[PDB]
Amino acid sequence: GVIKPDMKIKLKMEGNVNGYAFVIEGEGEGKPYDGTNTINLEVKEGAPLPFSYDILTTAFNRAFTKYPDDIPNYFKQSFPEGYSWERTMTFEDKGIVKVKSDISLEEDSFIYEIYLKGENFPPNGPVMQKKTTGWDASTERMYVRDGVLKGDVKHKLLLEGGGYYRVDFKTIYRAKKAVKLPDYHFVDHRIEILNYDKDYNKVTVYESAVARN
Ligand SMILES: [Cl-]
Ligand SMILES: [Cl-]
Ligand SMILES: [Cl-]
Ligand SMILES: [Cl-]
Ligand SMILES: [Cl-]
Ligand SMILES: [Pd+2]
Ligand SMILES: [Pd+2]
Ligand SMILES: [Pd+2]
Ligand SMILES: [Pd+2]
Ligand SMILES: [Pd+2]
Ligand SMILES: [Pd+2]
Ligand SMILES: [Pd+2]
Ligand SMILES: [Pd+2]
């Protein structure tokens, strides 16, 4: 078909967090049916980033999700035409991240065009102070509204020193063609920074995702 068992990844993110502009480019690979993917990121403008890299990582494609055969796959059906998504992340100290991403396909490589805005982060908060230590494993509730798929995550970031920092995710996924719509289901996530140079100019992100009834 169009979605191979091995697919490459290319992306560009143009970002602005509390007024600080930056550009990140990435390349990687994954196994869509296994629900795993790795992306190697480079900061192109804005290095070194003056905020927590964790607020970017979940922006760096649910095509990479293991789906049981009996739950229709909203994301894989959308190709070759593809899909786009938009996300609002609300942090417990009133910081906000807004993301738009367009996911397209060429040959055996996905292409992401990402725009990300962060705002209202307290100067002394864990994001601006770079005091976060990654995301917990999460469960995203997927449900259909207005002919598109929506996703909810009551998430938390882990903090340096053992604390935690709650974040609500709301995502809207929009296929660029008609597909068989699934009903209420869950996607379990695990996302991790595998390695980084000092100040995170070069970072590798790994994610696994599995859907379930
Ligand atoms: Cl492989
Ligand atoms: Cl949204
Ligand atoms: Cl190839
Ligand atoms: Cl918890
Ligand atoms: Cl069941
Ligand atoms: Pd393979
Ligand atoms: Pd290429
Ligand atoms: Pd480069
Ligand atoms: Pd662009
Ligand atoms: Pd805004
Ligand atoms: Pd700042
Ligand atoms: Pd420290
Ligand atoms: Pd809604």
Q: Which ligand is nearest to the CA of 68?
A: 5
Q: Which ligand is nearest to the CA of 183?
A: 5
The alpha carbon torsion through 67, 135, 171, 85 (nearest 10 deg) reads -80
Residue 106, strand partner residues: 109
Solved with: X-ray
Scored b (16 or more CB within 10 A) or e, 54-78 reads bbbbbbbbbbbbbbeeebebbbbbb
For 6, the token pair is 């091995």
Contact call for residues 119 and 99 (beta carbons, < 8 A): no
Contact call for residues 86 and 59 (beta carbons, < 8 A): no
Kindly give the distance from the C-alpha atom of residue 88 to the centroid of ligand 10, in angstroms, as a whole number. 10
CATH number at residue 132: 2.40.155.10
Q: Which residues are placed with Cβ below 5 angstroms of ligand 6, an ion? A: 6
Closest CA to 31 of 72, 94, 76, 86: 76
Contact call for residues 120 and 96 (beta carbons, < 8 A): yes
Kindly give the distance from the C-alpha atom of residue 70 to the centroid of ligand 12, in angstroms, as a whole number. 46
Kindly give the distance from the C-alpha atom of residue 41 to the centroid of ligand 10, in angstroms, as a whole number. 25
How many other C-beta atoms can be found within 10 angstroms of the C-beta atom of residue 124? 9
CA distance 9 to 26: 8
Kindly give the distance from the C-alpha atom of residue 6 to the centroid of ligand 1, in angstroms, as a whole number. 6
Closest CA to 51 of 157, 128, 135, 159: 128
For 179, the token pair is 């597909």
Kindly give the distance from the C-alpha atom of residue 158 to the centroid of ligand 12, in angstroms, as a whole number. 13
Number of separate domains in the chain: 1
Kindly give the distance from the C-alpha atom of residue 98 to the centroid of ligand 10, in angstroms, as a whole number. 7
Strands 109-119 and 7-17: parallel
- Resolution as reported, in Å: 1.9
Q: Which ligand is nearest to the CA of 118?
A: 10
For 204, the token pair is 């590798």
Kindly give the distance from the C-alpha atom of residue 7 to the centroid of ligand 10, in angstroms, as a whole number. 33
Q: For residue 129, what are the domain limits?
A: 1-213
Q: Which residues are placed with Cβ below 5 angstroms of ligand 3, an ion? A: 108
CA distance 48 to 22: 10
Kindly give the distance from the C-alpha atom of residue 151 to the centroid of ligand 13, in angstroms, as a whole number. 9
Rg of the chain over all Cα atoms, to the nearest angstrom = 17
Written in H, E and C, the secondary structure of the chain is CCCCCCEEEEEEEEEEECCEEEEEEEEEEEECCCCEEEEEEEEEECCCCCCCCHHHHCCCCCCCCECCCCCCCHHHHCCCCCEEEEEEEEECCCCEEEEEEEEEEECCEEEEEEEEEEECCCCCCCCCCCCEEEECCEEEEEEEECCEEEEEEEEEEEECCCCEEEEEEEEEEEECCCCCCCCCEEEEEEEEEEEECHHHCEEEEEEEEEEEC
CA distance 47 to 152: 32
Going by C-beta distance under 8 Å and a sequence separation of 6 or more, which residues neighbour residue 135? Answer: 54, 57, 58, 155, 156, 157, 158, 189, 191
